[PDB]
Amino acid sequence: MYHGALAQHLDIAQLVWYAQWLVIWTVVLLYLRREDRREGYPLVEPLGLVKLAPEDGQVYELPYPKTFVLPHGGTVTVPRRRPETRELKLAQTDGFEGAPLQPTGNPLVDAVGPASYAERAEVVDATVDGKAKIVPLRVATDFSIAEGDVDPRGLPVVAADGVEAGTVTDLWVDRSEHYFRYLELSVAGSARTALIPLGFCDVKKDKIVVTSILSEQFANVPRLQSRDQITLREEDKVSAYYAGGLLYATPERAESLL
Amino acid sequence: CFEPPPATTTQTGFRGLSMGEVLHPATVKAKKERDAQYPPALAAVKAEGPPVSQVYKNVKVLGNLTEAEFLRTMTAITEWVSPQEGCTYCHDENNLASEAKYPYVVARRMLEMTRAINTNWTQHVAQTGVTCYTCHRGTPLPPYVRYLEPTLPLNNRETPTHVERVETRSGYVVRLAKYTAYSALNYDPFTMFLANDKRQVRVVPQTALPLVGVSRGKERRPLSDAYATFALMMSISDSLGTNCTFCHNAQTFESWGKKSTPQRAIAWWGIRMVRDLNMNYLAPLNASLPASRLGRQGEAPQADCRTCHQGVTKPLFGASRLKDYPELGPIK
Amino acid sequence: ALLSFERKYRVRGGTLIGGDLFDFWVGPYFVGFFGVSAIFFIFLGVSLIGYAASQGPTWDPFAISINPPDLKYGLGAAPLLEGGFWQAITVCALGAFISWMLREVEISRKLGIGWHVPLAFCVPIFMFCVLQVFRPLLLGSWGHAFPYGILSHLDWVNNFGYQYLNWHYNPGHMSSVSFLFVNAMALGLHGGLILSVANPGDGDKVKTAEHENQYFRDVVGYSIGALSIHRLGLFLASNIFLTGAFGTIASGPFWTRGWPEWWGWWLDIPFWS
Amino acid sequence: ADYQTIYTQIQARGPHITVSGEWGDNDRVGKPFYSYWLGKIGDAQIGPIYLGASGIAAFAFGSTAILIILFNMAAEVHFDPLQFFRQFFWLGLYPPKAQYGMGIPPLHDGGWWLMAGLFMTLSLGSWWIRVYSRARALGLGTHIAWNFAAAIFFVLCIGCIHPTLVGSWSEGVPFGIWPHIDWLTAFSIRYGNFYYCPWHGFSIGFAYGCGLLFAAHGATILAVARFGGDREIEQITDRGTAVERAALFWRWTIGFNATIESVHRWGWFFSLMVMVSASVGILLTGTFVDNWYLWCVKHGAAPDYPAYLPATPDPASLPGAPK
Numbered sequence A: 001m002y003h004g005a006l007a008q009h010l011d012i013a014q015l016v017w018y019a020q021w022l023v024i025w026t027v028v029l030l031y032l033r034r035e036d037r038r039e040g041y042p043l044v045e046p047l048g049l050v051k052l053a054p055e056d057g058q059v060y061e062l063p064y065p066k067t068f069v070l071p072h073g074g075t076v077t078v079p080r081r082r083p084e085t086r087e088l089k090l091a092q093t094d095g096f097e098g099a100p101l102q103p104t105g106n107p108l109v110d111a112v113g114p115a116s117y118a119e120r121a122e123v124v125d126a127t128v129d130g131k132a133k134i135v136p137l138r139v140a141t142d143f144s145i146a147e148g149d150v151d152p153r154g155l156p157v158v159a160a161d162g163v164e165a166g167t168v169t170d171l172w173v174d175r176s177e178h179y180f181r182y183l184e185l186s187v188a189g190s191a192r193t194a195l196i197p198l199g200f201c202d203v204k205k206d207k208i209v210v211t212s213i214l215s216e217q218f219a220n221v222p223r224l225q226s227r228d229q230i231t232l233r234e235e236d237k238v239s240a241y242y243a244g245g246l247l248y249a250t251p252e253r254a255e256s257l258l
Numbered sequence B: 001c002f003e004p005p006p007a008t009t010t011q012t013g014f015r016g017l018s019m020g021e022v023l024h025p026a027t028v029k030a031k032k033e034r035d036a037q038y039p040p041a042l043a044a045v046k047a048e049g050p051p052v053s054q055v056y057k058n059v060k061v062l063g064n065l066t067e068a069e070f071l072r073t074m075t076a077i078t079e080w081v082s083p084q085e086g087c088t089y090c091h092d093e094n095n096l097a098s099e100a101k102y103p104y105v106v107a108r109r110m111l112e113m114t115r116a117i118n119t120n121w122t123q124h125v126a127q128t129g130v131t132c133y134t135c136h137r138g139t140p141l142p143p144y145v146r147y148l149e150p151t152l153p154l155n156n157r158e159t160p161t162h163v164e165r166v167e168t169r170s171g172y173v174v175r176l177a178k179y180t181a182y183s184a185l186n187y188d189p190f191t192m193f194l195a196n197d198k199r200q201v202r203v204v205p206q207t208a209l210p211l212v213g214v215s216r217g218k219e220r221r222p223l224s225d226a227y228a229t230f231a232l233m234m235s236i237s238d239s240l241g242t243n244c245t246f247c248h249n250a251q252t253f254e255s256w257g258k259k260s261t262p263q264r265a266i267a268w269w270g271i272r273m274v275r276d277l278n279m280n281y282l283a284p285l286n287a288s289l290p291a292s293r294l295g296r297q298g299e300a301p302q303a304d305c306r307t308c309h310q311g312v313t314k315p316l317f318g319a320s321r322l323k324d325y326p327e328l329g330p331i332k
Numbered sequence C: 001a002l003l004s005f006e007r008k009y010r011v012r013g014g015t016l017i018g019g020d021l022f023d024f025w026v027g028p029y030f031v032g033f034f035g036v037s038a039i040f041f042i043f044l045g046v047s048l049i050g051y052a053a054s055q056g057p058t059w060d061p062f063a064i065s066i067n068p069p070d071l072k073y074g075l076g077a078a079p080l081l082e083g084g085f086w087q088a089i090t091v092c093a094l095g096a097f098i099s100w101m102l103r104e105v106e107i108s109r110k111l112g113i114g115w116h117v118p119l120a121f122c123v124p125i126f127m128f129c130v131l132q133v134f135r136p137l138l139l140g141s142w143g144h145a146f147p148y149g150i151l152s153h154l155d156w157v158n159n160f161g162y163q164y165l166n167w168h169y170n171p172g173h174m175s176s177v178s179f180l181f182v183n184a185m186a187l188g189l190h191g192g193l194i195l196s197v198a199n200p201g202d203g204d205k206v207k208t209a210e211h212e213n214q215y216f217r218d219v220v221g222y223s224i225g226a227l228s229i230h231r232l233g234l235f236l237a238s239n240i241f242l243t244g245a246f247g248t249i250a251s252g253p254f255w256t257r258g259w260p261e262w263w264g265w266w267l268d269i270p271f272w273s
Numbered sequence D: 001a002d003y004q005t006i007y008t009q010i011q012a013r014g015p016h017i018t019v020s021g022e023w024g025d026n027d028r029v030g031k032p033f034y035s036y037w038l039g040k041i042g043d044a045q046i047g048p049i050y051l052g053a054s055g056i057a058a059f060a061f062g063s064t065a066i067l068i069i070l071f072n073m074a075a076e077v078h079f080d081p082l083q084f085f086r087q088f089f090w091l092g093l094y095p096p097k098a099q100y101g102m103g104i105p106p107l108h109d110g111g112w113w114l115m116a117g118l119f120m121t122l123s124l125g126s127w128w129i130r131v132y133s134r135a136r137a138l139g140l141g142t143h144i145a146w147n148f149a150a151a152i153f154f155v156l157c158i159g160c161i162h163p164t165l166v167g168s169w170s171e172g173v174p175f176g177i178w179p180h181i182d183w184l185t186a187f188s189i190r191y192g193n194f195y196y197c198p199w200h201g202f203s204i205g206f207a208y209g210c211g212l213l214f215a216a217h218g219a220t221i222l223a224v225a226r227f228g229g230d231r232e233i234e235q236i237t238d239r240g241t242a243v244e245r246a247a248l249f250w251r252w253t254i255g256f257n258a259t260i261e262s263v264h265r266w267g268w269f270f271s272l273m274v275m276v277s278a279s280v281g282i283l284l285t286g287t288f289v290d291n292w293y294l295w296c297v298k299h300g301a302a303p304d305y306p307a308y309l310p311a312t313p314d315p316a317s318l319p320g321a322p323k
């Protein structure tokens, strides 16, 4: 006789092969694939002239809502109906459902395509002890540039067009993670600062090079509402602005690379 | 630590299974040259007159040979085994029938063993056969032999370091590794497998499910048996200068038929041949050998696959003197 | 059709090649020129797979196998049924993989994000080439490449390993395995931690960046920080093949003995021999 | 090009942060010190480290295991120092070579191996507790402890439970660099080729998949570092253009997408399953399957190829074959 044999032809391992697969597709389809839908759902579409259905599939694919209780108060519940009310300066290029949109204005300031931001909270991100998390070193006094690295305060910022566009006046530090995230510059010939996320900066010894945008375009970089604070949504606006330069700073940038 | 291209590769299995030999051309050539030292056959003599059984005094094995043939054999034997030493290695200078010296009597048994291999182990040695040279390679002590413990260097013509010396306990794990293609396998496949017929090489079950009755507790072979078998195969592989797929399709080691090459059946015979020689010819010689020949437990040096093959899948690349010296077998 | 937030990102531009011609979506899928060529090759390669498989006996999925030619055909074109199908399918596979990669670049451009993913993706395409293309060229025959079959490709891996007696002692392999094992643990750690912070239990508050750093400082004495564990993971993962590639390439063209013997360079240092 | 994703162009230094445990804040020992080079591709602060009981316990047992192993290894090169250093990889501490069933093996034949195996087990236990507690102490969920548990269980499977299930200590994994490796082949050979074990395949599928997933996740976050994609907790509670872009990249490429939280679930799961699949495969092996290739052959799975060299009959089955 054999250990594991169950019937004429049928044994333990063989049955477990079936359970293994079932456990896998269950977790993937019924759990993980529904957790994947806590943002962005339900899918938006054209609308019907007459429709009345709590459309079944849109119910079935969603998990039950979860609520995060936020560290510094409040809650957030996902999924949730999170429609984009903001107007978009875009026009359909051709008619069909799959056609790309074109900006009808200045995509950089219109914030469309790679220049878009998320409708994040207009709140200042906090450290664990309640303070503003991302602040200029003018404020973040107990913070410093590590010995060995370029201090950029003083250096010229040089835009894609080869032209000096301003002068670095400060670094903003993340006091939760001890990590610089933006440079602040006095914009040339303007009475404004601009933050520029450190990822858009090639830090040289003698200058800071920014290839995302021409010097012209620094003028319209998003402005913060205060000066020593930045909100989650502002961070998004500032970051998106330069990102949009990568496709939009000049006319040929959207076109075929080669 | 590397060997430059090209590599020589063969195919020993259905395309896409990555089965076959992988050879470094320079090593092959170097072994070819070593084996090329096989002395060519002595010129053929015409058989004039009486069998030496009548003629000579103390001839047991080659008694039916005419005198000219007989002295031809004695000459070949001398150049195969004791060329540096000459006829006197085994003979009393002044009495040739004298069995005074041990090489004589040992050599008498080796004539028997040799005709045994060529007559009875046809399924292994086939029509290539062996001669004294196959093992001895021109010295009385064959260069590759085994004692009942691992020893180093493998080639006993090389001088041991301290650590290699069998008395140096600290060098044991290495004496064992160099016998099993540098593995760490803690088993000696020679004493386990080839010295005698006590152990079973096959360890893999032949049913999909565990048979009730051999599959629990002390009923079971310990897993250490599968290591040993692996050690033996590491050894056989290194001995023939080849790899597993020379013999197995690794999909199912345990299977034969299409899953095994013809050389595996031949190797199966060789395991049996080696056991016969060790148990019935070589091991008993500890009776007839000087102490200096014997190992730490009074064992005669004995044979594994390397003793003949010395790193080639066919010994001496298949060179044969069989038709040249029929004295040595096959003996009808 | 569109995620709630999608429409605003769906702008023209970003193509490597083609421009406006294929710049559009079919469903969720971006097409683009490379979408078009990805699809062409897939269709080819899959069609050949079917035709080849039909000429075989088995239609059992586990048992179907499309194999390279005998070694004798060398680096030359083999008869269709005797390696030729395999040669064709290999070209289509490469065509599909590289198309998929260049398509990813175009999607990255349109979205204004870095090109790290199509890059990370070059590593497995690279390792495919080591096995199927480079190593066979070095050894001088397509017949050393692996067969296309769910199980038969394992019989190749098996035998390839045992050609060198014990493939475990291959120092390239040892490095490769270590990266496979670290990366699997790291992904557990990184995934576990982000979930533990965002999902504390009961009704407790979502925690913070400072908490993540504290946890690993406490447990192992070092926290690599939030951006850097993503860099680490991309590194550890990629090095599974980047180091492995060397062990694969060495076997045959640069080392013909068993792998345990390679360690002789250490064991046999005469100083301690 | 974003150089930040390669390394930190300008490092910030600031006052050491401590997040308070619900206990044990006073067992954190050591002075934080900073490394400029570390700082270039990671956080610069090394240390402090929490001690604690479970940790100290873990160290105690771990070190005892290691002592037993190393002493038996030293015995093996007969306490020669230089041969020890030379032969270290080859040196091992083995389970019973003899079949004692489940009998406590003699010290020389596996007794010491069991000892070490026992202390290592307690070592892992203690460490698990540390990993679980620090989470709870810091107000965190215990996902990590639960991923680790799976890993520890696998070790128990190959070290303990499988030997127990078939009833022989001879089957456990030796301690030693090459020796623990030689076991892999001994074990695969005895049980009919682990390639043909379905759970070995699931396991590999998930291990490969962890490489796929961590390469793609890591690359995805670097690719949106410009938008603060690294700040993953607040991208969860307040979705930003970072993870909108990440998600859309994946949607446009493969047709579906995760969220920034759910992708870490996919990852945790793939990691867990490597260890879960592996254990199931070990529990079935020897207990209910003896030869995985034949089991596959029994069930129609296995490929079969033409002969290339001629089919070779088992000589042992021939008429007249010796034994």
Ligand code: BCB
Pocket (backbone or CB within 6 Å): C097, C124, C125, C127, C128, C131, C157, C158, C159, C160, C161, C162, C166, C167, C168, C170, C172, C173, C174, C176, C177, C180, C240, C241, C243, C244, C245, C246, C247, C248, D184
């Ligand atoms: C008996 C033989 C053995 C063996 C033989 C072996 C060989 C011969 C090789 C490895 C290699 C490797 N082995 Mg070893 N191995 C490994 C682990 C590993 C891997 C880390 C490594 C790389 C795998 C690879 O090349 O992927 C390749 C994967 C590729 C190329 C994926 C390509 C994907 C493509 C880009 C996209 C695919 C698209 C699909 C068609 C799309 C489908 C569409 C659907 C999904 C929508 C472990 C963990 C162990 C253990 C625990 O024992 C082990 C044991 C052994 N290996 C045995 C001892 N191993 C390789 C290596 O690196 O050696 C150093 C190698 O060459």
Ligand code: BCB
Pocket (backbone or CB within 6 Å): C046, C049, C128, C131, C146, C150, C151, C153, C154, C157, D195, D200, D201, D202, D204, D205, D206, D208, D209, D212
């Ligand atoms: C050097 C060693 C190699 C190796 C060693 C290896 C082993 C030892 C094992 C596998 C296993 C597997 N391998 Mg193989 N492998 C595979 C694909 C596969 C799957 C059949 C399976 C699960 C893989 C997995 O989940 O990855 C992670 C990726 C995930 C989770 C995403 C989903 C991928 C999807 C499952 C891919 C399925 C591919 C389709 C069968 C391909 C069909 C193409 C067309 C017709 C659509 C591909 C597509 C390639 C290519 C293109 O290079 C490849 C190369 C190699 N494998 C190397 C030759 N692989 C396991 C198996 O179970 O074999 C049957 C297994 O045990």
Ligand code: BCB
Pocket (backbone or CB within 6 Å): C157, C181, D061, D062, D063, D065, D066, D120, D123, D124, D151, D152, D154, D155, D158, D183, D184, D185, D187, D188, D193, D194, D195, D197, D199, D200, D203, D204, D207, D274, D277, D278, D279, D281, D282
């Ligand atoms: C010829 C031999 C083969 C073999 C034999 C083999 C066996 C016998 C086993 C595997 C198993 C596995 N194999 Mg296979 N294998 C694998 C890959 C894998 C893994 C996915 C999986 C083992 C899980 C693991 O990560 O262990 C590594 C992870 C570990 C060990 C977790 C440890 C956790 C622990 C808490 C850490 C503790 C560390 C502390 C520091 C301890 C310190 C203590 C001190 C005091 C001493 C690949 C990718 C390949 C290829 C490419 O060929 C392959 C080929 C083969 N394997 C050959 C067929 N494989 C396992 C399996 O899945 O079987 C079903 C299994 O048991």
Ligand SMILES: C/C=C1/c2cc3[nH]c4c(c3C)C(=O)[C@H](C(=O)OC)c4c3nc(cc4[nH]c(cc(n2)[C@@H]1C)c(C(C)=O)c4C)[C@@H](C)[C@@H]3CCC(=O)OC/C=C(\C)CCC[C@H](C)CCC[C@@H](C)CCCC(C)C
Pocket (backbone or CB within 6 Å): C038, C041, C042, C045, C046, C089, C092, C093, C096, C097, C100, C104, C117, C118, C120, C121, C123, C124, C147, C148, C149, C150, C153, C237, C238, C239, C240, C241, D208, D209, D211, D212, D215, D216, D219, D253, D254
């Ligand atoms: C070190 C880093 C690693 C790494 C990294 C990354 N991996 C990526 C990315 C990154 C970063 C992506 O961006 C890209 C992706 O989109 O992610 C979702 C991708 C992807 N990784 C897949 C499979 C996968 N990754 C493996 C391994 C690693 N990934 C390692 C671990 C393995 C292993 C281990 O076996 C597999 C099988 C696909 C799902 C997907 C390509 C789809 C495709 O290319 O579409 C184009 C092609 C098709 C849909 C079909 C083509 C069919 C051909 C023409 C006909 C068959 C050809 C033939 C060869 C079949 C042989 C079968 C036989 C062997 C049985």
Ligand SMILES: C/C=C1/c2cc3[nH]c4c(c3C)C(=O)[C@H](C(=O)OC)c4c3nc(cc4[nH]c(cc(n2)[C@@H]1C)c(C(C)=O)c4C)[C@@H](C)[C@@H]3CCC(=O)OC/C=C(\C)CCC[C@H](C)CCC[C@H](C)CCCC(C)C
Pocket (backbone or CB within 6 Å): C181, C182, C184, C185, C188, C189, C219, C220, D058, D059, D060, D061, D062, D063, D066, D067, D123, D124, D127, D128, D131, D144, D145, D147, D148, D151, D271, D272, D274, D275
């Ligand atoms: C699929 C997912 C997997 C996965 C998952 C996870 N893995 C985890 C976790 C998760 C989630 C944890 O949370 C836990 C952890 O903490 O992470 C930071 C852990 C861990 N995974 C380790 C090793 C590892 N994971 C492997 C594999 C996988 N992991 C698989 C792949 C492998 C493989 C690949 O072989 C390895 C080797 C350790 C680093 C760690 C345990 C430490 C321990 O258990 O400590 C036990 C304690 C000791 C050994 C003490 C002895 C040490 C000293 C220095 C010796 C001194 C000797 C001296 C004589 C004394 C003198 C004293 C003096 C004062 C006089």
Ligand SMILES: CC(C)=CCC/C(C)=C/CC/C(C)=C/CC/C(C)=C/CC/C(C)=C/CC/C(C)=C/CC/C(C)=C/CC1=C(C)C(=O)c2ccccc2C1=O
Pocket (backbone or CB within 6 Å): C026, C029, C030, C031, C034, C035, C036, C038, C039, C042, D212, D213, D216, D217, D218, D220, D221, D243, D246, D247, D250, D251, D253, D254, D255, D256, D257, D258, D259, D260, D263, D266
């Ligand atoms: C219909 C047609 C012919 C159209 C023309 C257009 C066209 C070219 C279509 C292509 C159709 C084809 C060929 C489709 C095949 C799609 C493929 C290759 C699918 C493979 C899917 C697989 C198997 C993935 C394996 C990895 C896996 C387990 C993923 C699940 C989790 C996901 C989705 C991770 C990706 C993902 C990662 C990695 C993040 O880090 C991240 C971070 C923050 C937000 C989101 C994400 C995110 O989505």
Ligand code: HEM
Pocket (backbone or CB within 6 Å): B056, B057, B058, B059, B060, B061, B062, B063, B071, B074, B075, B077, B078, B081, B082, B086, B087, B088, B089, B090, B091, B096, B097, B098, B103, B104, B105, B107, B108
């Ligand atoms: C060297 C060329 C050499 C000579 C010469 C030689 C001669 C020889 C004769 C003539 C006999 C017969 C003596 C008698 O009447 O019994 C004979 C027999 C044997 N020999 Fe010899 N021999 C020479 C060399 C060697 C060598 C190198 C050895 C030992 C390896 C050796 C051995 C023997 C043996 C054994 C016999 C007995 C043979 C038998 O059929 O029983 N000889 N030799």
Ligand code: HEM
Pocket (backbone or CB within 6 Å): B077, B081, B103, B104, B106, B107, B110, B111, B112, B114, B130, B131, B132, B133, B134, B135, B136, B140, B141, B142, B145, B277, B282, B285, B289, B293, B300, B301, B302, B303, B307, B308
């Ligand atoms: C061929 C007919 C043949 C002869 C002759 C021969 C002789 C021989 C002698 C003289 C000895 C003793 C050597 C010594 O000084 O001790 C001896 C020993 C061994 N031989 Fe031999 N041998 C002949 C054939 C063969 C063959 C075919 C093999 C290998 C299968 C072989 C092997 C050995 C071995 C082993 C020994 C024992 C160790 C030793 O005493 O040197 N011989 N042989």
Ligand code: HEM
Pocket (backbone or CB within 6 Å): B200, B201, B202, B203, B204, B205, B229, B230, B233, B234, B236, B237, B240, B242, B243, B244, B245, B246, B247, B248, B253, B254, B255, B263, B264, B265, B267, B268, B269, B271, C162, C165, D189, D316
């Ligand atoms: C290469 C290092 C190698 C491996 C591995 C290997 C394995 C192996 C196993 C697991 C067995 C056991 C089979 C069973 O349980 O039924 C086995 C058996 C034999 N082998 Fe082997 N083998 C390796 C290499 C070689 C080589 C190079 C050859 C042929 C020259 C060979 C031959 C054999 C033979 C014969 C057997 C059966 C033993 C007997 O029946 O007594 N192997 N091998």
Ligand code: HEM
Pocket (backbone or CB within 6 Å): B117, B124, B125, B126, B127, B128, B129, B130, B134, B236, B240, B263, B264, B266, B267, B270, B271, B272, B274, B303, B304, B305, B306, B307, B308, B309, B313, B314, B315, B318
């Ligand atoms: C030891 C157990 C051993 C093994 C293993 C072995 C294998 C082996 C093979 C695979 C062949 C055939 C190779 C091929 O066909 O290409 C082969 C052939 C011969 N062997 Fe052998 N052999 C082992 C041991 C021994 C010993 C100890 C001797 C010498 C006394 C010996 C001899 C030979 C001879 C001669 C041949 C050649 C046959 C031919 O066709 O040329 N073997 N061996």
Ligand SMILES: CC(C)=CCC/C(C)=C/C=C/C(C)=C/C=C/C(C)=C/C=C\C=C(C)\C=C\C=C(/C)CC/C=C(\C)CCCC(C)C
Pocket (backbone or CB within 6 Å): D066, D069, D070, D104, D114, D115, D117, D118, D120, D121, D155, D156, D158, D159, D160, D172, D173, D174, D175, D176, D177, D180
């Ligand atoms: C007592 C009875 C009756 C029953 C007990 C049952 C029981 C719980 C048994 C458990 C058995 C187990 C768990 C066995 C497991 C074995 C396994 C999985 C071993 C695996 C691998 C082992 C390896 C790789 C070990 C190799 C050797 C070492 C790491 C050498 C140690 C070296 C050091 C750590 C260096 C120290 C110095 C350094 C800190 C600078």
Ligand SMILES: CCNc1nc(Cl)nc(N[C@](C)(C#N)CC)n1
Pocket (backbone or CB within 6 Å): C186, C189, C190, C193, C212, C213, C216, C220, C222, C223, C224, C225, C226, C229
């Ligand atoms: C911000 C999260 N920090 C963090 N995260 C992770 Cl997953 N690991 C670490 N540190 C290591 C990798 C561990 N364990 C220590 C080498 N730090």
Ligand SMILES: CCCCCCCCCCCC[N+](C)(C)[O-]
Pocket (backbone or CB within 6 Å): D053, D054, D057, D122, D123, D125, D126, D129, D133
């Ligand atoms: C099985 C492993 C050994 C168990 C004993 C290890 C020490 C226990 C320490 C428990 C500490 C409790 N605490 C603080 C985490 O809740």
Ligand SMILES: CCCCCCCCCCCC[N+](C)(C)[O-]
Pocket (backbone or CB within 6 Å): A024, A028, A029, A033, D201, D202, D205, D206, D209, D256
């Ligand atoms: C072999 C290991 C297990 C493989 C599991 C792979 C899961 C990926 C499946 C994604 C399915 C996508 N979708 C839209 C159909 O749900």
Ligand SMILES: [Fe+2]
Pocket (backbone or CB within 6 Å): C190, C194, C230, D217, D221, D232, D264
């Ligand atoms: Fe992450």
